[PDB]
Design a binder for this molecule. Structure first.
Ligand SMILES: NS(=O)(=O)c1c(F)c(F)c(SCCO)c(F)c1NC1CCCCCCC1
Ligand SMILES: [Zn+2]
Length: 253
């Protein structure tokens, strides 16, 4: 999988045609304000980043999730979700790259901060539960630079190819958040195989702005390993999937 794009994944993972697949188009006019959504709590003051890795499909920054350092709580969530890693999906052009869309609009990229429900003890147990993960999704549009992103961009040359990693300590993910925490939420899935339906998605309404030069540097990563023909790492997003009977709730309006 990666002739092997998202339209093929159902043959190995039949849940690809399931009832709670992600991403989805967020129709802002049909999302329902839910005044009962409890306040969202993003507590990242003790986050401990470890490493950055080129997985062959995207890059990710991993955290020490062996204690409750950085956690997500509140909003639609019951209980405590620990930050495990963040990663991005992005496009070959500035008008595509996000996984979720808003009124059919695609953004240049989307940041996913992935958290697992600590009641399940480990993330591998959490991924087999309907409420195992909470992913905070943040859109990226191209405009002014994002200062809090530059440390990540500057390390990408050291993880150009599949399977490279590098130390990535002391990175503060708070620098990647927009001002507002207004959000939409809905039940969905992972967006790559095995596509399991274990995610409570929380998608922030306010995008962050990143510079043309920052996203250009995402696009110089490679899907291939070292010493293999170069395939630029672009368009690593899954398109919107049918919403089926689901309701998207809004925390605002
Ligand atoms: N959008 S997403 O969160 O489904 C996601 C991808 F689309 C990916 F393409 C990747 S890289 C391929 C899987 O190793 C990914 F790590 C995650 N997240 C991981 C989160 C950590 C543990 C849960 C398992 C899913 C992979
Ligand atoms: Zn993702």
């Amino acid at each position: 999988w990666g002739h092997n794009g998202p339209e093929h994944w159902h043959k190995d993972f039949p849940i690809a045609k399931g009832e709670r697949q992600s991403p989805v188009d967020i129709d802002t006019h049909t999302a329902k304000y839910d005044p009962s959504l409890k306040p969202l709590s993003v507590s990242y003051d003790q986050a401990t980043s470890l490493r950055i890795l080129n997985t062959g499909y995207l890059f990710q920054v991993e955290f020490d999730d062996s204690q409750d350092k950085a956690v997500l709580k509140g909003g639609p969530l019951d209980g405590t979700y620990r930050l495990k890693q963040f990663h991005f999906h992005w496009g070959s052009l500035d008008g595509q790259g996000s996984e979720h869309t808003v009124d059919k609009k695609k953004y240049a990229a989307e940041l996913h901060l992935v958290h697992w429900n600590t009641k399940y003890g480990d993330y591998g147990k959490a991924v087999q539960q309907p409420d195992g993960l909470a992913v905070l999704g943040i859109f990226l549009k191209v405009g002014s630079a994002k200062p809090g992103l530059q440390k990540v961009v500057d390390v990408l040359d050291s993880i150009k190819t599949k399977g490279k990693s590098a130390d990535f300590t002391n990175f503060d993910p708070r620098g990647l958040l927009p001002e507002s925490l207004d959000y939409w939420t809905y039940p969905g899935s992972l967006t790559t195989p095995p596509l399991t339906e274990c995610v409570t998605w929380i998608v922030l309404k306010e995008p962050i702005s990143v510079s043309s030069e920052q996203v250009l540097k995402f696009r110089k990563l490679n899907f291939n390993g070292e010493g293999e023909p170069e395939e630029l790492m672009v368009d690593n997003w899954r398109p919107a999937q049918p919403l089926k009977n689901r309701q998207i709730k809004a925390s605002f309006k």
